[PDB]
C-alpha cells in the first residue's frame, strides 16, 4: 500500500481523507446487519473517497473550460454527463440547477 | 486611544498609497510582493479596502507591519 501512517485515527491509518469511525457508526445504526466487521468501514470509506474525487476532478476541469475558479451545480452536471461511467451510475439523478447539455439535432439546422 | 490609532493608520495608508503611485506600483503588486516576502499573499481587494480603511482596526494593525515592509523594499 502507501508507505506509512502513524497518527491515532483510523482514517490516518488507512491513508484516507474520509472518516472511518463515522462510517462505522452509520453502518451499525440503520439495521444493515447485526454485526459490522473491522474492515467494512475502512473499505467503504476508501470507495466513497475515490468516487468523490472523480466527480470533483471532472467538475474542476469543466470550471477551467469556462474560465472560472469555482465549481457550481452546472459544472457537476457537465462532469457527469460527459463521462460514461458516471452517467450510468447517476443516470436517474436530477441535479437541482444543473441544466442540460447543448444537444441540437442536425436535422433542425 | 482609538483616535490616535485611527490617525496613525490613516497616515500610514496615505504614505503607502503615495509611494505606491510614485514608484508606479499597482494594488495587485502590493498583494503579490507581500506573498513573496511573507508567505501571505493578498489580493487587490484587500489592498483596496485597506487603503480605503474599510477594514477593522485589528486587521489594519496586523497587516500594517507587512505593508511597512512593502514600502521599505
Amino acid at each position: 500500500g502507501k508507505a506509512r501512517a502513524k497518527a491515532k485515527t483510523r482514517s490516518s491509518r488507512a491513508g484516507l481523507q474520509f472518516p472511518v469511525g463515522r462510517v462505522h457508526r452509520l453502518l451499525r445504526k440503520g439495521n444493515y446487519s447485526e454485526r459490522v466487521g473491522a474492515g467494512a468501514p475502512v473499505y467503504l470509506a476508501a470507495v466513497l473517497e475515490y468516487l468523490t474525487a472523480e466527480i470533483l476532478e471532472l467538475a474542476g476541469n469543466a470550471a477551467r473550460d469556462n474560465k472560472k475558479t469555482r465549481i457550481i451545480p452546472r459544472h457537476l452536471q457537465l462532469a457527469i454527463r460527459n463521462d460514461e461511467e458516471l452517467n450510468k451510475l447517476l443516470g436517474r439523478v436530477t441535479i437541482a440547477q444543473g441544466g442540460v447539455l447543448p444537444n441540437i439535432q442536425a436535422v433542425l439546422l | 486611544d482609538i483616535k490616535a490609532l485611527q490617525k496613525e493608520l490613516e497616515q500610514f495608508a496615505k504614505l503607502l498609497k503615495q509611494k505606491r503611485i510614485t514608484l508606479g506600483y499597482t494594488q495587485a503588486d502590493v498583494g503579490l510582493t507581500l506573498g513573496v516576502l511573507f508567505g501571505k499573499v493578498f489580493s487587490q481587494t484587500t489592498i483596496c479596502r485597506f487603503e480605503a480603511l474599510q477594514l477593522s482596526f485589528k486587521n489594519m494593525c496586523k497587516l500594517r507591519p507587512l505593508l511597512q515592509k512593502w514600502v521599505e523594499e
Partner: protein, 81 residues
C-alpha cells in the same frame, strides 16, 4: 382553489420544449403537456402528503418531497437527503 393549471402558459411550455431541442410545436401540445404535468404532480404530491401525515405534521417539507420522488425512481440531489 380552481383552474391554476392555466398558469402554465404557452411560453412556459415552449421554453421547456426548446430546452429539450424541439424546433416546432403543434397547437395541441399545450393541452397535452398540461395533462402530463398534472399527473406527475398528483402522484408526487400525494406521496409527500402521505409521509407528512404519517408523521402527524401539517407542513409538507422538502424531505417529504424528496422521498416521494425517490420512490418513483427519480432521485433528486441538492434539497436535503
Amino acid at each position: 382553489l380552481r383552474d391554476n393549471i392555466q398558469g402554465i402558459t404557452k411560453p412556459a411550455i415552449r421554453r421547456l420544449a426548446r430546452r429539450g431541442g424541439v424546433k416546432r410545436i403543434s397547437g395541441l401540445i399545450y393541452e397535452e403537456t398540461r395533462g402530463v404535468l398534472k399527473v406527475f404532480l398528483e402522484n408526487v404530491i400525494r406521496d409527500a402528503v402521505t409521509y407528512t401525515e404519517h408523521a402527524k405534521r401539517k407542513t409538507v417539507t422538502a424531505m417529504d418531497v424528496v422521498y416521494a420522488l425517490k420512490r418513483q425512481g427519480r432521485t433528486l440531489y441538492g434539497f436535503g437527503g
